[PDB]
């Protein structure tokens, strides 16, 4: 991690840029949430910029970030560089309307939540009910953020679905492809 005459990420945070550049776990979520709240406290009106290069990860960690974005007053712009997959693409779609971007060769991927369950029939039932409810919640929010019907989201996330930046724009996951 190079130094600038600050470590580079700390320097970007000074300009209200937050980097979501890894797998989403609780540590990443806690850090992004803290950064969002800190930037709001510094200035509640200026835009924040969330740069996304992430294969996704934990749904609950992702929702910590999502809920914080919607809670704070500043608009959070989202820019997909490289890849936004799974909960990564969910967060890309969560940026302020009109301010969700992807670079031309960026990859967006949407699919259904993944999990597991072991034990008694009753325990597997509880786990299944929980992950299905989680999927309904994700799909409902994606419907609201994209303008697509719940029926279409359900069909399009049934298996891994890879989108170009242009396709992500057509879908309503982003507003513009950032052209050179």
């Amino acid at each position: 991690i190079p130094t600038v005459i600050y470590d580079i990420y700390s320097r970007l945070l000074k300009d209200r840029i937050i980097m979501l550049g890894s797998q989403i776990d609780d540590n990443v979520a806690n850090s992004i949430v803290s950064q969002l709240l800190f930037l709001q406290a510094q200035d509640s009106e200026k835009d924040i910029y969330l740069y996304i290069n992430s294969p996704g990860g934990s749904v609950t960690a992702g929702f910590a970030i999502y809920d914080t974005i919607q809670h704070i007053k500043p608009d959070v712009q989202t820019i997909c560089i490289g890849m936004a997959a799974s909960m990564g693409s969910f967060l890309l779609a969560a940026g302020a309307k009109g301010k969700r971007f992807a670079l031309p060769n960026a990859e967006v991927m949407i699919h259904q939540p993944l999990g597991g369950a072991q034990g008694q029939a009753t325990e597997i039932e509880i786990a299944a009910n929980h992950i299905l409810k989680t999927r309904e919640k994700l799909n409902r929010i994606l419907s609201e953020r994209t303008g697509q019907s719940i029926e279409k989201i359900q069909k399009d996330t049934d298996r891994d679905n890879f989108l170009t930046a242009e396709e992500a724009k057509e879908y309503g996951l982003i507003d513009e492809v950032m052209v050179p």
Partner: peptide
């Protein structure tokens, strides 16, 4: 990535 992000 400015203009406009930032």
């Amino acid at each position: 990535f400015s203009p406009x992000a930032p």
